[PDB]
Paper text:
The FP2-EC48 structure, resolved by molecular replacement, revealed two FP2 copies per asymmetric unit of the crystal. Both protein copies exhibited bound EC48 inhibitor (see below) and had nearly identical tertiary structure, with root-mean-square-deviation (RMSD) of Ca atoms below 0.1 Å. Analysis of the structure suggests that EC48 binding is mediated by hydrophobic and π-stacking interactions between the benzodioxol group of the inhibitor (demarcated #1 in the inhibitor structure) and the W449 sidechain of FP2. In addition, the structure provides a mechanism for the observed mixed inhibition of FP2 by EC48, as the molecule occupies part of the substrate binding cleft, thereby competing with substrates, and locates just 5.1 and 7.5 Å away from the FP2 H417 and C285, respectively, which comprise the catalytic dyad.
Mature FP2 is a 27 kDa papain-type protease responsible for cleaving haemoglobin to small peptides, with 93% sequence identity to FP2′ and 68% to parasite falcipain-3.
Residue numbers in the entry: -17 to 223
Write the structure that this text describes.
Amino acid sequence: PQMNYEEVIKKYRGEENFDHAAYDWRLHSGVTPVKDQKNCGSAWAFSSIGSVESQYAIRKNKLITLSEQELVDCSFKNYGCNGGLINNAFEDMIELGGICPDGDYPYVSDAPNLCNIDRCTEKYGIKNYLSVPDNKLKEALRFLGPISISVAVSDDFAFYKEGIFDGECGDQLNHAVMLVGFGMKEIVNPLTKKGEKHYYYIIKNSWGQQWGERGFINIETDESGLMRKCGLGTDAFIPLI
Ligand SMILES: O=C(/C=C/c1ccc2c(c1)OCO2)c1cccc([N+](=O)[O-])c1
């Protein structure tokens, strides 16, 4: 079973209020390096692993890079390079008794590979995972950390280079990414000649560092963070170590 969000957020937030404007885990030792999935539909493994890596960095100040390949090979609830679910991934991490660091189990993508849970002496596990309600993404980011989220990607998304992306959404939820924070940029309109506050979510994508902004993409949101473009965060899970 998963955990109750309201019971967990009471524990990590308390009564403490926060700034809805800008916050980014990359600046507070909460975001591990950007990785790549070449010719493989294993985003589900990159998105969930990365969230675990983040929790070790946040809760234990332990930078550990874990094996997506072990998840691709050994996650039996999911279909490696054919697609999977973030929650099933977390269920299988618990069942497997954790994952080997990617130093002991490297990523070989679509290349055929067999599952071997004994590639290392010490595995890195999780206690459980939590489902984040679509209206509490900004609060969950701020007090719990980076979230494994689903998103609907369009071909325009693959052509993203910099700034904030909007209005080019996929037909269905096809990709798994990590929500690493939120921000705001005040921009004076060239027409009205008046200043406007432009809020955005900061997302970590597993398409290498050559993609977008150092492997990251900023997506338009509002001050509240209720605005979820391309169904971002429809599926929102955060592991707890
Ligand atoms: O795994 C993918 C490829 C992503 C990708 C990699 C490099 C790129 C790119 C997209 O655009 C430019 O360079 C990918 C993602 C979503 C859907 C499908 N699919 O055809 O079923 C493949």
